[PDB]
Amino acid sequence: EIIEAMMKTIAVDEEGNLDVSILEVGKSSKKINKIEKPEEKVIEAAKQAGIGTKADIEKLLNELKSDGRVYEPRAGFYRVI
Amino acid sequence: MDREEMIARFAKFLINRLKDLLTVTPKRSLAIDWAHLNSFDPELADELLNNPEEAIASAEDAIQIVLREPPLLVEREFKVHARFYNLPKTLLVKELGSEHINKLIQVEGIITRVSEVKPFVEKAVFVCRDCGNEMVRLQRPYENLVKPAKCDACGSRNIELDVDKSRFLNFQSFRLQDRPESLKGGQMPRFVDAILLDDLVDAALPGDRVLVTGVLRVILEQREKRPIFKKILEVNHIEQLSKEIEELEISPEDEQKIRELAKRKDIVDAIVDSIAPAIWGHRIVKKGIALALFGGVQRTLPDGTKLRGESHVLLVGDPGVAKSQLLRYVANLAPRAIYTSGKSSSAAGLTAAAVRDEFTGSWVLEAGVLVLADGGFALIDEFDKMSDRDRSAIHEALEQQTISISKAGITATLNSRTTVIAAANPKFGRFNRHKSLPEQLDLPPTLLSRFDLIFLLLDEPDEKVDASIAEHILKVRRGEAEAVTPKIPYDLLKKYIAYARKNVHPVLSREAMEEIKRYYVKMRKGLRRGDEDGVQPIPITARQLEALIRLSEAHARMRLSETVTREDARAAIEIIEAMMKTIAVDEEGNLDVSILEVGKSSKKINKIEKPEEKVIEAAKQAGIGTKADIEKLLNELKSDGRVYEPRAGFYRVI
Numbered sequence: 185e186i187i188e189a190m191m192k193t194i195a196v197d198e199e200g201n202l203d204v205s206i207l208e209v210g211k212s213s214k215k216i217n218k219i220e221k222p223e224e225k226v227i228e229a230a231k232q233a234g235i236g237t238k239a240d241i242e243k244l245l246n247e248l249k250s251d252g253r254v255y256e257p258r259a260g261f262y263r264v265i
Numbered sequence: 266m267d268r269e270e271m272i273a274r275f276a277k278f279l280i281n282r283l284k285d286l287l288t289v290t291p292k293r294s295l296a297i298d299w300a301h302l303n304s305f306d307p308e309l310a311d312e313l314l315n316n317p318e319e320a321i322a323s324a325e326d327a328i329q330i331v332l333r334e335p336p337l338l339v340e341r342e343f344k345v346h347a348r349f350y351n352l353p354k355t356l357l358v359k360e361l362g363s364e365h366i367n368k369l370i371q372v373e374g375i376i377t378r379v380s381e382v383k384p385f386v387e388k389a390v391f392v393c394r395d396c397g398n399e400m401v402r403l404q405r406p407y408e409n410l411v412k413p414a415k416c417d418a419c420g421s422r423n424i425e426l427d428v429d430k431s432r433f434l435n436f437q438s439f440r441l442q443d444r445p446e447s448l449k450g451g452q453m454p455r456f457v458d459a460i461l462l463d464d465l466v467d468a469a470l471p472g473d474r475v476l477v478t479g480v481l482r483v484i485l486e487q488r489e490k491r492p493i494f495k496k497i498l499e500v501n502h503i504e505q506l507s508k509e510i511e512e513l514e515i516s517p518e519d520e521q522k523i524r525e526l527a528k529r530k531d532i533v534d535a536i537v538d539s540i541a542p543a544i545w546g547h548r549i550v551k552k553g554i555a556l557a558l559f560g561g562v563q564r565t566l567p568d569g570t571k572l573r574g575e576s577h578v579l580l581v582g583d584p585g586v587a588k589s590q591l592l593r594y595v596a597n598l599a600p601r602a603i604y605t606s607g608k609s610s611s612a613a614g615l616t617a618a619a620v621r622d623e624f625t626g627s628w629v630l631e632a633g634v635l636v637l638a639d640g641g642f643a644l645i646d647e648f649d650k651m652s653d654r655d656r657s658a659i660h661e662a663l664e665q666q667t668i669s670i671s672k673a674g675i676t677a678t679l680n681s682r683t684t685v686i687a688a689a690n691p692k693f694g695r696f697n698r699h700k701s702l703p704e705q706l707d708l709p710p711t712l713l714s715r716f717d718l719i720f721l722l723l724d725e726p727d728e729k730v731d732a733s734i735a736e737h738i739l740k741v742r743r744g745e746a747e748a749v750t751p752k753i754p755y756d757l758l759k760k761y762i763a764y765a766r767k768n769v770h771p772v773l774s775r776e777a778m779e780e781i782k783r784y785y786v787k788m789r790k791g792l793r794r795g796d797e798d799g800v801q802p803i804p805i806t807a808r809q810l811e812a813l814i815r816l817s818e819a820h821a822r823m824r825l826s827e828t829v830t831r832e833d834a835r836a837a838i839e840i841i842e843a844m845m846k847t848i849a850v851d852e853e854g855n856l857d858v859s860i861l862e863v864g865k866s867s868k869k870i871n872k873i874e875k876p877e878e879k880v881i882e883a884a885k886q887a888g889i890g891t892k893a894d895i896e897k898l899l900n901e902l903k904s905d906g907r908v909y910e911p912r913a914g915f916y917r918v919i
């Protein structure tokens with residue numbers, strides 16, 4: 185009951201993935217990063233794809249800019265490494 | 266103390282060694298035995314053990330006398346360095362302490378650091394502008410340079426170094442450390458640095474087990490502490506360890522019980538169940554690790570080449586599969602194994618490297634796990650996390666089992682004859698069944714072709730396997746008997762593996778060769794032309810054939826048989842087939858372990874795919890791939906440079 189209440193009060197995921205270890209939800213978070221793997225073009229490409237909202241895909245590519253998977257080639261450009 | 270008496274006693278004791286020294290002209294060193302001295306005069310041995318400074322010089326003068334006055338006198342009084350290569354007690358680096366300074370000791374260990382040859386000055390002749398040029402100072406090789414405060418002849422202070430009259434000799438500096446794999450229960454890596462001289466210079470390589478025996482000296486550092494600071498072993502004689510000191514020890518009844526266990530039925534199943542009984546399942550992984558432990562026979566053809574006899578295993582899996590534990594139990598079960606991690610804090614974790622030292626800033630070569638474990642195992646956890654320097658030499662330390670490093674003026678061809686039972690993790694976080702193996706692994710594609718066994722420790726949410734592993738975990742936590750008691754005890758299994766790797770050298774048989782040929786020709790031409798003509802999916806290669814031969818010779822050694830029978834070849838073939846099935850390398854078994862792309866669905870599509878919207882529409886109407894297929898194709902081309910974007914909505918090729 186304590187473990188059941190712990191996973192509920194944290195709300196790790198909508199399906200129960202162990203997000204305490206892998207921060208990615210996995211159900212609809214890690215998969216989207218593989219679909220993502222120009223800046224004005226990839227937002228329009230993700231809009232018709234529906235993998236994530238505008239605010240969501242903005243953080244998906246920016247978080248990848250930290251590790252370096254998705255870099256910014258030029259002004260308004262976004263290409264994977 | 267009675268120096269003349271010591272010289273007379275040494276002359277009366279000293280003759281076969283002197284005869285052998287007089288026979289060969291260029292040889293100058295003389296190897297004196299301590300057992301001969303004990304059989305002749307134990308008082309001289311006690312005097313040598315008391316004060317080695319007045320003992321080596323007196324013995325040297327005495328052997329020079331016995332070389333001069335008796336016949337066969339050499340024209341020149343060349344330096345005859347007394348090299349005592351025996352002592353009643355063989356100390357260790359961990360046992361060594363300050364109570365052995367200024368006494369002839371015999372410490373054993375393994376060399377980890379090595380310096381270059383330097384011309385150190387022995388008798389520094391000090392020159393001055395005024396008189397007082399004959400002044401000399403007998404400096405020490407381990408100590409630093411000393412300068413006189415004033416010349417006693419005339420009171421002048423214009424001192425200088427006369428490099429013309431100074432006698433320079435060879436000097437080397439190494440670091441003797443405790444054998445980590447041979448001695449790991451103590452967990453004491455304390456070590457003592459040592460110096461080598463004109464005769465002992467360039468005697469051993471880093472990672473070799475040597476038995477050095479010299480006078481433990483000491484050097485003063487500064488005035489920060491009143492007593493001495495650091496001790497430096499002045500090596501008098503160096504010699505490599507024998508073939509029993511650096512290996513396990515066995516008894517006659519131990520050999521008898523090992524033979525009896527070998528005669529026991531289902532020995533292979535017992536060995537597999539005896540490897541890490543705590544972790545449930547992974548029977549194929551345990552069998553592969555066992556086959557890696559009983560490594561194949563290492564043969565050297567007369568043409569000069571050396572055939573490989575080490576089966577490397579890579580355990581790729583998602584976190585939480587107890588892969589790390591697998592690397593802990595085998596670390597203590599294997600005879601010679603150094604359990605390490607990928608995130609190594611040392612400057613040379615696995616590959617040797619030339620780094621600056623602290624004594625004089627001189628470049629010294631320091632070895633790593635892949636060198637100190639010569640003739641053993643190296644369980645490298647988190648193999649995906651390696652520095653860029655180590656990712657360029659592991660390609661040679663596996664195939665050529667050697668490390669040729671020449672940076673910083675330190676040329677050395679080390680021998681990395683280690684079995685790498687490693688375990689890597691996917692860079693994405695979890696392995697995907699719909700993608701290839703090197704596409705999610707941080708290791709380069711060429712590196713994956715080295716490991717003879719690549720097991721996928723992928724977890725699956727199946728009700729049966731989850732219930733089984735939960736029951737096993739509850740049993741191992743409750744303290745159940747048969748859950749932690751293997752069929753073979755750990756010490757006996759370790760001695761068994763040692764005996765098999767030392768005395769059992771199986772040879773191939775015509776039946777096993779016929780079976781291997783049949784399997785190879787069955788695998789070859791395995792629908793290779795299918796869906797790929799330019800790059801037909803290759804099901805197997807000669808490398809993997811050599812790996813299968815090594816695994817077949819591993820199953821014959823596991824049961825202590827000198828002939829690789831048909832059963833061993835069939836077991837190796839079954840293991841290879843299970844690995845190829847659980848890997849899912851390609852649709853038709855293409856060897857993506859070298860290119861990291863299947864020739865049917867990845868490499869073919871890439872060539873027929875290499876604007877953005879216009880080109881994806883053209884691909885869609887021509888039939889190269891669907892929407893997601895062309896999206897992944899354009900992403901791959903962007904990453905490679907073939908869809909780089911100069912403008913918005915543009916995927917031109919460079």
Ligand SMILES: Nc1ncnc2c1ncn2[C@@H]1O[C@H](COP(=O)(O)OP(=O)(O)OP(=O)(O)O)[C@@H](O)[C@H]1O
Binds near residue numbers: 587591738
């Ligand atoms: N078959 C099994 N039998 C017993 N325990 C298991 C089994 N599979 C997983 N475990 C448990 O999973 C836990 C984690 O394992 P461990 O940390 O040793 O390796 P790992 O989890 O694979 O490492 P990583 O998560 O970094 O891949 C351990 O406590 C272990 O007991």
Ligand SMILES: [Mg+2]
Binds near residue numbers: 589
């Ligand atoms: Mg771990």
